[PDB]
Design a protein around this ligand. Structure first.
Ligand SMILES: CCC1=C(C)/C(=C/C2=NC(=C\c3[nH]c(/C=C4\NC(=O)[C@H](C)[C@H]4CC)c(C)c3CCC(=O)O)/C(CCC(=O)O)=C2C)NC1=O
Ligand SMILES: CCC1=C(C)/C(=C/C2=NC(=C\c3[nH]c(/C=C4\NC(=O)[C@H](C)[C@H]4CC)c(C)c3CCC(=O)O)/C(CCC(=O)O)=C2C)NC1=O
Ligand SMILES: CCC1=C(C)/C(=C/C2=NC(=C\c3[nH]c(/C=C4\NC(=O)[C@H](C)[C@H]4CC)c(C)c3CCC(=O)O)/C(CCC(=O)O)=C2C)NC1=O
Ligand SMILES: CCC1=C(C)/C(=C/C2=NC(=C\c3[nH]c(/C=C4\NC(=O)[C@H](C)[C@H]4CC)c(C)c3CCC(=O)O)/C(CCC(=O)O)=C2C)NC1=O
Ligand SMILES: CCC1=C(C)/C(=C/C2=NC(=C\c3[nH]c(/C=C4\NC(=O)[C@H](C)[C@H]4CC)c(C)c3CCC(=O)O)/C(CCC(=O)O)=C2C)NC1=O
Ligand SMILES: CCC1=C(C)/C(=C/C2=NC(=C\c3[nH]c(/C=C4\NC(=O)[C@H](C)[C@H]4CC)c(C)c3CCC(=O)O)/C(CCC(=O)O)=C2C)NC1=O
Ligand SMILES: CCC1=C(C)/C(=C/C2=NC(=C\c3[nH]c(/C=C4\NC(=O)[C@H](C)[C@H]4CC)c(C)c3CCC(=O)O)/C(CCC(=O)O)=C2C)NC1=O
Lengths: 172, 162, 162, 162, 162, 172
């Protein structure tokens, strides 16, 4: 919904004045690095499903009480529900880093993630640790170049790290 | 939960009627099934460890490569063997619950809902558990109505599995 | 039928509006993709026979047992080898259509809709075609924007396949 | 030309002295060797044809890019695979000669002295013949002392190749 | 240590003769060489980083079994590809040194004298560096006389490797 | 250049009387354990190449200077010569456990080797670490049993550890 261009537009409309020149220089920097947004989104959407399985792999090696009967992730239906939750969480991370604004992820996950997880009985600790490990693996596959022309990517690293910590403190 | 008493209750709920005589016959059929299903679950629980042990060893001899190549689904080292034997023990325990419940409901809810999806995302093969259930249905060695009712549950799991 | 022009048309149909400038930018992006996608499809069509031949050979060396055991999915005799090579040729042709269409639509409609279901009912394994596509994406040997756009399509097929 | 007898003769010639008491033992120690060695050469002659066919199977299954990629060195077509049967048959025959002579001298004279330039100029990766000799040393099934002598034997072959 | 000047000194030195007119010509013929050679070394220094990245791309596209098959020599994971960047960067830097010195002596001293045992013991097929140097000699885009020098140059590299 | 049989011979000659009975029990049990000894040597030289590359690969993982430029084993012939030296030290320690005596080892290769490595500029402690790791793999290759009758080779595990230790301490 809200893009960083539309973020600047909404600030300039709340002020009701024309946009400042230095903010337009910041937007010139943004459109200069839009190809690196493309590089990162393409890279992690290439490997996304394997990242989801590896995150569930570290979660289920870490906490065997979830696989254990009576656990919340025990049943086959609930296991598919778990992988559904992680897949759509990584999907909204990809949405947010494609848009550049966290408003998509916030306005479509922050609202009811905690709510569903306390209402169902879902332990929010496991989802928080899982989205943290998934974010570490996502930075790991994004940052290292494999046959890719070299450049700096620290701002993007900061951006997806912020997106995954907003997810982590969303579910808690 | 596929239970003929509860399925009858769900039917009469959807109709909004009181208990009809169809439901009385349904109860009669459930008692007729249980009158050997309980003893069959008893001897299955007696045999269960030898069943899952022979089934795991038979699947390992059935495909040598899962023992051979190092992989994540396969049992290269002993932890994969433990997870594999845990899975077949889970299967046989679902079979016992499926038998004692009078319907496919424990099987349906606890296995059949997303088995092929986790087999897809973990790159497992359902044919492993198919031939495992074939070894179990060859190994239980029972006779009578109870034997073929259990065999019906087992091949139901096979058909829904593949 | 994931085509960015047609997806833009479907969007403006759902909005009920005329053509907006967003769609003009969408057309610009499609032309930018096609300006190397067509030449990439050309060299892929040039390389295609060696690609599917090396991919079949590499999958046969990747798992020796499909050549070894007599089975119905596996290539025991030569007819299974023919069906296997037909399948990888089908895969690479879908990749070329997926490239030339500008989106995943030929892939989606012609493979992704029921691939895991026929793999379930025929007891195939998708990992065979996964490692086949890995050999193809290792073998095409291209550089530039076209190479990674094709590689993106290939790993999309890999991710949806597994 | 390394057999124990010719090395005893070479030592006595270089020192200029006739064979001593120590020289005599050499041949009755060639009894500990030869009393199994001639048996093992005969049973390798019997095992030979299935050994080369299985070694070709193992080399093609380990490296599918040989059977896939078109080239002069690679066995894409028939005549390349015929060259492979020739090369592995030569290796197995030199193993049999090396076993009958008692020392590595036939194998060191007929194979080892030029293998580095041939593998350099003709693009024959030696890991292929590593696979072939490892498959032979796994598949030959020699019994007792004869098997161990060959193993030191076939490891010398791999060490010359690697 | 092959530069034309040190070979003139070695000839005079081996002979024991004082410097002569024949030796002198080499110095102003090293002008026909060096007047382009230092330019070409600078433009190779500029071209260097995209040259190694494209050569790694070409080697991975020619041989997909390197990026696929797990091994110490093969570049399956990251650290193998880091070793590849190191190796091709070493090759390109020795080409630049060989270009600045005027003779093959830096390249013949720093690369060629041990490459046969390293490729034998560490399982590095030299056709990989054949691909790398052929991609470099196609991609460097040298102009006129400087380009001709490199071909004689880079062909000597391939002839030492093959 | 001394076999343990002629060690007993030369010691009894410097004494100057016949070989005593206690040395003859010892030599008889040497004859009963030399079976273990000789082909312990050959199973050590079975995987001698893979032992050499594994020890060198571990050494250049432990010390990244030796493949860094400016290091001692950096250029290609110096690296090949280092592999040659490690093969030579393994081959001579193999000769020494075949003779049953460390006299061939201290006599043939170790003695001037200390001065050679100092005068070349070659590090000695790196060689010491290499021969120690090589010795660990060496006994275990011989020690592990594949297609061999179970037996007590403890002395062999013992004596070959002594021989590798003398090699590493004499390199220094
Ligand atoms: C688009 C934004 C969006 C999100 C993120 C979302 C999540 C969501 N996750 C759910 C369940 C679930 N989520 C989990 C999660 C886990 N399993 C565990 O034990 C771990 C703690 C964690 C593993 C990752 C489980 C087991 C269920 C099923 C709960 C149940 O069966 O009641 C449900 C209940 C519905 C269902 O049964 O599928 C919703 C609505 N819904 C949305 O609309
Ligand atoms: C999806 C199909 C597709 C891809 C892949 C695509 C990629 C792409 N990445 C690019 C640049 C770039 N992309 C990167 C990004 C990176 N480099 C790194 O070292 C990091 C590991 C990584 C960031 C995570 C950098 C650093 C540049 C060049 C300078 C810059 O723009 O920052 C460019 C500009 C010119 C070029 O380098 O080719 C293109 C076209 N365009 C497409 O249509
Ligand atoms: C009550 C019914 C029920 C079943 C059956 C069930 C199975 C089940 N098996 C699993 C994994 C697994 N299953 C296997 C099994 C095998 N690999 C082999 O060598 C054998 C052929 C096979 C033994 C059957 C392995 C190796 C894993 C872990 C996959 C991996 O390690 O990444 C997982 C993923 C979580 C995990 O163990 O680590 C589930 C949920 N869960 C259930 O709730
Ligand atoms: C355009 C995209 C597209 C694809 C890819 C496709 C695949 C496809 N492969 C099939 C079967 C098959 N696929 C295989 C394949 C294999 N067994 C092996 O040895 C190899 C590992 C593997 C080669 C990939 C075999 C052996 C059969 C027949 C199964 C049997 O004979 O019963 C079938 C069932 C009908 C039949 O051939 O007899 C379909 C529909 N169809 C499509 O429309
Ligand atoms: C007595 C000892 C002896 C050895 C060791 C030997 C090696 C040898 N192998 C050769 C060819 C060959 N050897 C192979 C075999 C293989 N290449 C591959 O890629 C496969 C993986 C492998 C099959 C195992 C092939 C394909 C050629 C053909 C080269 C050509 O046709 O140019 C040639 C060229 C001679 C010719 O043109 O027929 C020699 C000299 N020849 C000998 O006389
Ligand atoms: C200055 C001249 C010079 C040359 C020629 C040279 C070759 C050389 N390449 C090496 C490793 C390597 N070189 C490669 C590169 C490749 N292998 C492949 O399979 C790819 C196709 C290819 C990428 C182009 C790899 C993967 C290793 C790793 C070996 C290992 O880790 O054991 C090593 C082992 C050193 C180490 O462990 O880092 C040497 C000595 N070194 C030099 O100093
Ligand atoms: C029979 C016993 C015997 C030994 C042991 C022996 C050693 C020996 N090692 C040498 C060099 C060498 N030795 C090494 C050693 C190593 N590289 C490292 O970085 C490590 C510190 C160490 C590996 C353990 C290197 C790099 C050279 C080459 C130095 C040079 O030749 O310039 C040389 C100089 C000749 C040459 O190979 O170029 C001799 C004579 N010679 C003998 O006759």
């Amino acid at each position: 919904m809200f893009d960083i261009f539309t973020r600047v537009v909404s600030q300039a409309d709340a002020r009701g004045e024309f946009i400042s020149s230095d903010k337009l220089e910041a937007l010139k920097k943004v459109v200069a690095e839009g190809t690196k947004r493309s590089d990162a989104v393409s890279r992690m959407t290439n490997n996304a499903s394997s990242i989801v399985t590896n995150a569930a792999r570290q979660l289920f090696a870490d906490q065997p009480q979830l696989i254990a009967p009576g656990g919340n992730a025990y049943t086959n239906r609930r296991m598919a529900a778990c992988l559904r939750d992680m897949e759509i969480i990584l999907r909204y991370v990809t949405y947010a880093t494609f848009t550049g604004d966290a408003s998509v992820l916030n306005d479509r996950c922050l609202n009811g993630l905690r709510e569903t997880y306390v209402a169902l009985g879902v332990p929010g600790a496991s989802v928080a640790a899982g989205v943290r490990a998934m974010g570490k693996a996502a930075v790991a596959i994004v940052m290292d170049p494999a046959g890719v022309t070299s450049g700096d990517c620290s701002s993007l690293q900061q951006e997806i790290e912020l997106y995954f910590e907003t997810a982590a403190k969303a579910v808690e | 939960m596929k239970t003929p008493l509860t399925e009858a209750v769900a039917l009469a709920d959807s109709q909004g009627r009181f208990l009809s005589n169809t439901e009385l016959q349904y109860l009669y059929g459930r008692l007729r099934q249980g009158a050997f299903a309980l003893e069959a679950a008893q001897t299955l629980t007696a045999k269960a460890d030898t069943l899952v042990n022979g089934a795991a060893q038979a699947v390992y001899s059935k495909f040598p490569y899962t023992t051979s190549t190092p992989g994540n689904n396969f049992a290269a080292d002993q932890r994969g063997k433990d997870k594999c034997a845990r899975d077949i023990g889970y299967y046989l325990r679902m079979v016992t619950y499926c038998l004692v419940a009078g319907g496919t409901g424990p099987m349906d809810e606890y296995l059949i809902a997303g088995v092929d999806e986790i087999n897809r995302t973990f790159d497992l093969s359902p044919s492993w558990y198919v031939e495992a259930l074939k070894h179990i249905k060859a190994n239980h060695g029972l006779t009578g109505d109870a034997a073929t009712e259990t065999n019906n549950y087992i091949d139901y799991a096979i058909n829904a599995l593949s």
